[PDB]
Design a protein around this ligand. Structure first.
Ligand SMILES: Cc1cc2nc3c(=O)[nH]c(=O)nc-3n(C[C@H](O)[C@H](O)[C@H](O)COP(=O)(O)OP(=O)(O)OC[C@H]3O[C@@H](n4cnc5c(N)ncnc54)[C@H](O)[C@@H]3O)c2cc1C
Ligand SMILES: O=c1nc2n(C[C@@H](O)[C@H](O)[C@@H](O)CO)c3cc(O)ccc3cc-2c(=O)[nH]1
Ligand SMILES: [Cl-]
Length: 491
């Protein structure tokens, strides 16, 4: 008799889930499992806000509903996978364990340990690729055994390899449930908890809801305008747009696997077929999925990718240990409203537009404050709802000119950058209410408002909103000087 586990970690969906499909095939009982793992709650190492963790819980609640609707049940097991799984293998008479492959450092250690244990229990292990467009090992293999290090040569590689696989079909309308009266499957030990019960003190404030149903809705909303999809150009999109964000906001759903990257890609290709002037990579929407694939592919084959030291793709730079600069940045009190509004969005929504992530990451690292990208990445690791190990590392290295990108003379202005999109400062008025009534003339530079104007707007620099912590002209020149010297020490 076939008794199977479908183990969810990412891949939090029923659509495009070949793992799930294999688990159901010829099965008497299927046990859908997510292991609520203490590794992600020990705030010592690994950081997570209530925003992200509650987005996860919402996604698990949506899975529960999808499984309940098909005659089954999601089991949220508490514990370390190494010690939970041997128990349930025996208790449930498990013959097959299915899960979606992942390539992160923790995933590799965890997944090796669970395979060894599975083999000891006589349990078959089935691990299809479906978090990424392609099997990332296959790509490296086809490229002659190393990952390409530019987006251009990565794009050429995948064009030679061909289209990603189709989304797998939808799973059956009825699924075999867990067997009755299994003690590790007791409802009360296996329900989706709340953020309160997991132990978060403060409520989540983000406006984006977790789960596959929300992911599919947001995918559908995006594809209701095929000209927009066809003509999408990432660098030409507006980072100050918040009522209707200028990009898809599909990142947290792709991060958790509430949305299938292959579904998204197949949908793009349908549109591109009927729209022959469609944008091409890297700026196109397909280009965006390829950035993701690119950084996963490089990231999974490089040791210490998420660090500077011991990381072969990363420049060793003499970053300042400057806790007050980092704290001002982290706590949204740099005195540059563009920067502080974005850092407020980070902590409220857990999502900003890519170019707002550029402004704040450039400002922290190579642009003004010369703090290590690792400090920035950690702050993003806590607050981003789309926090992705490889994508966050790679973009921080890109923005600090530590890897992939070397043009350290290009520095974004914390005053001018947003102003060319949003001269009235609508974005700033949203995320920093204290500047609601400041005239647009002064909103990017409130320290240049006459004192009469500051008082009239109820926002006096130094009292209600802080003075700027640097002079951008002085800070950037110094930072460019230090970057030049670090590059010359490297050669
Ligand atoms: C300092 C810094 C840190 C970042 N950290 C993260 C992170 O932790 N997680 C994360 O998903 N993205 C990260 N990004 C990339 C990018 O900013 C987000 O993926 C994007 O803003 C998400 O919005 P969207 O879903 O509307 O993307 P769209 O423009 O709609 O693109 C669709 C999808 O493509 C992928 N994608 C888009 N841009 C990029 C990119 N530059 N690199 C890799 N993949 C991309 C994402 O999965 C995204 O959902 C970071 C960028 C910077 C500059
Ligand atoms: O299997 C789990 N995956 C969790 N993941 C999912 C993955 O990151 C996955 O476990 C691994 O593939 C990462 O190495 C989380 C992701 C977040 O962004 C935030 C919190 C979690 C928590 C968990 C968890 O408790 N259990
Ligand atoms: Cl709990």
């Amino acid at each position: 008799v076939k008794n199977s586990i479908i183990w969810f970690r990412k891949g939090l969906r029923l659509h495009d889930n070949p793992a799930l499909l294999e688990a159901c095939k010829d099965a008497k009982h299927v046990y859908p499992v997510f292991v609520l793992d203490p590794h992600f709650l020990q705030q010592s190492s690994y950081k997570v806000s209530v925003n992200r963790y509650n987005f996860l819980l919402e996604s698990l609640e949506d899975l529960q509903r999808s499984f309940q609707a098909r005659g089954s049940r999601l089991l949220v097991l508490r514990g370390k996978p190494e010690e939970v799984f041997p128990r349930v293998f025996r208790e449930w008479g498990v013959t097959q364990l299915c899960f979606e492959h992942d390539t992160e450092p923790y995933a590799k250690v965890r997944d090796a340990a669970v395979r060894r244990l599975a083999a000891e229990a006589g349990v078959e292990v089935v691990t299809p690729i479906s978090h990424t467009l392609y099997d990332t090992d296959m790509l490296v293999a086809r490229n002659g055994g190393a990952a390409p290090l530019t987006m251009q040569s990565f794009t050429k590689l995948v064009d030679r390899v061909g289209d990603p696989p189709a989304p797998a079909p939808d799973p059956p309308a009825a699924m075999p449930p867990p067997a009755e009266d299994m003690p590790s499957a007791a409802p009360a030990a296996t329900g989706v908890p709340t953020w309160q019960e997991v132990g978060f003190k403060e409520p989540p404030l983000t406006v984006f809801k977790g789960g596959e149903t929300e992911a599919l809705a947001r995918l559908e909303a995006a594809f209701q305008d095929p000209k927009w999809v066809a003509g999408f150009q990432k660098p030409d999109t507006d980072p100050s747009a918040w009522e209707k964000p200028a990009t898809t906001v599909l990142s947290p759903y792709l991060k958790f696997g509430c949305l299938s990257a292959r579904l998204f890609h197949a949908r793009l290709l349908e549109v591109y077929r009927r729209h022959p002037a469609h944008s091409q990579p890297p700026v196109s929407l397909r280009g965006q999925l390829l950035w993701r694939e690119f950084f996963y592919t490089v990231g999974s084959t490089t040791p210490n990718f998420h660090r500077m030291a011991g990381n072969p793709v990363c420049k060793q730079i003499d970053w300042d240990d400057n806790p007050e600069f980092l704290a001002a940045w982290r706590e949204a009190r740099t005195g540059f409203p563009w920067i502080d509004a974005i850092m407020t969005q980070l902590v409220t929504w857990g999502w900003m537009h890519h170019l707002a992530r550029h402004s704040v990451a450039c400002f922290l690292t190579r642009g003004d404050l010369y703090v290590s990208w690792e400090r920035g990445m950690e702050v993003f690791e806590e607050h981003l709802i789309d926090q992705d190990h490889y994508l966050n590392a790679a973009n921080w290295m890109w923005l600090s000119a530590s890897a992939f990108f070397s043009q350290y003379f290009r520095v974004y202005s914390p005053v001018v950058f947003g102003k060319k999109y949003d001269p009235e400062g609508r974005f700033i008025r949203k995320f920093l209410p204290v500047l609601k009534d400041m005239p647009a003339k002064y909103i990017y530079e409130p320290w240049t408002a006459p004192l009469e104007v500051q008082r009239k707007a109820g926002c006096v620099v130094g009292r209600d909103y802080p003075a700027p912590i640097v002079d951008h002209a002085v800070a950037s020149k110094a930072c460019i000087a230090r970057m030049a010297a670090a590059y010359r020490r490297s050669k």
